Write a protein that binds this ligand. Structure first.
Ligand SMILES: O=C(O)[C@@]1(O)C[C@H](O)[C@@H](O)[C@H]([C@H](O)[C@H](O)CO)O1
Length: 383
């Protein structure tokens, strides 16, 4: 890989700063957030970078009052290089005491589509969880009020503003389903122009002229809840999903006509956590980038890898992110999202956990923004 001859570049700093950190991220209304989790990042066709997250208002839990927040780079050309290159925190949607989350964006010409999940504020995945008013949640169920919804919002002004989210659950989530997830992380635009958004048990396929899409479900057998999608260099689709049990990623391949079986990929250990994947380039040699925690049991083993295979069958060892660690962000590791930047870097959002209450709800979570070039990956000491 000729990119391995270039000087290695990496830079890293916190982008979503939890309430306990200096200069914590707050909305202009003064609403702050205990934790930020569940990153998503895209480069728009202007070069601007849009970074999304869940702003978890009172604690780090997945339920309760959670708003879908974002930042953009201040210009289309600054590539997110420095902290001051990013705008202040904004909100896509925060209505009610509800959970709004699972940001799953895809760029489509001059429109950015953002899928997201939602649940009523009185419900959680497991039920019985304590809320700030002293009540306990109900368990997410198959009722309209109690089941996870799927929403879509759009921007046609480079992320500056977002349309009121539209509930797509009735057409883009299977009937009878209770829990659900879209992404989180990103969707893609295929070489043939369709949009593909990964979701629990299914892909969501957008067809139509750029910026005027209509969506349908591609139901999958054996897919995970938190999936990634990526058109590999051979032109095929690949789902690379978070497994149910800890162990390894679960991967399937196919086309818009259907995917083959999901199988455990023993080359990609995973602790049952979200991962991210990115088609980096089409020219020679074509590359797919993958990021996750490369450990069957912990989220603190973040690793970024390259595959040169046309089907992304094999990834290299790659680079452990801890080689370029940050010391004032807690313990890095968790969900991630990657984009290419205009200046030939990979930009990655990565969760980090201050862990002050260990795994309890009071531990503050923040999100790191990393940029690095291919050479940094290729030249890793164990690669
Ligand atoms: O960090 C996790 O592990 C998390 O809890 C965070 C997400 O907000 C949540 O929606 C998702 C879900 O619980 C699993 O995918 C099982 O359905 O996972």
């Amino acid at each position: 890989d000729p990119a391995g001859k270039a000087a290695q570049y990496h830079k890293e700093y916190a982008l979503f700063r939890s309430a306990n950190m200096p200069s914590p991220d707050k909305l202009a209304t003064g609403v702050g957030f205990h934790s930020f989790r569940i990153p998503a990042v895209v480069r728009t066709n202007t070069g601007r970078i849009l970074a999304f997250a869940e702003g978890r208002r009172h604690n780090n839990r997945d339920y309760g009052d959670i708003n879908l927040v974002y930042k953009r780079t201040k210009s289309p050309t600054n590539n997110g290089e420095n902290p001051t290159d990013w705008e202040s925190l904004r909100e896509v949607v925060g209505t009610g005491p509800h959970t709004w989350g699972n940001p799953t964006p895809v760029v489509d010409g001059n429109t950015i589509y953002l899928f997201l999940s939602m649940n009523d504020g009185a419900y959680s995945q497991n039920g019985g969880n304590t809320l700030p008013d002293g009540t306990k949640t109900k368990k997410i169920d198959s009722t309209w009020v109690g089941r996870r919804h799927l929403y879509l919002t759009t921007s046609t002004d480079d992320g500056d503003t977002w349309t009121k989210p539209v509930d797509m659950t009735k057409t883009l989530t299977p009937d009878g389903q209770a829990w659900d997830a879209v992404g989180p992380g990103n969707g893609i635009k295929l070489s043939t122009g369709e949009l593909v958004i990964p979701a629990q048990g299914r892909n969501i396929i957008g067809r139509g002229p750029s910026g005027n899409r209509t969506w349908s479900m591609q139901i999958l057998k054996g897919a995970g809840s938190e999936g990634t999608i990526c058109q590999t260099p051979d032109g095929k689709l690949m789902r690379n999903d978070r497994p149910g049990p800890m162990g390894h990623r679960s991967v399937a391949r196919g086309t818009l006509a259907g995917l083959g079986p999901f199988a455990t990929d023993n080359g990609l250990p995973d602790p049952a956590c979200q991962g991210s994947i990115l088609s980096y380039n089409s020219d020679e040699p074509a590359r797919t980038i993958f990021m996750n925690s490369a450990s069957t049991d912990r989220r603190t083993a973040m690793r970024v890898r390259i595959s040169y295979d046309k089907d992304a069958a094999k990834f290299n060892f790659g680079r452990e992110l801890k080689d370029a660690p940050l010391g004032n962000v807690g313990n890095e590791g968790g969900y991630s999202s990657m984009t290419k930047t205009s200046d030939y870097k990979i930009g990655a959002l990565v969760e980090s956990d201050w862990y002050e209450d260990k795994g309890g709800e009071k531990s503050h979570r923040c999100i790191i923004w990393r940029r690095f070039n291919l050479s940094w990956i290729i030249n890793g000491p164990n690669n």
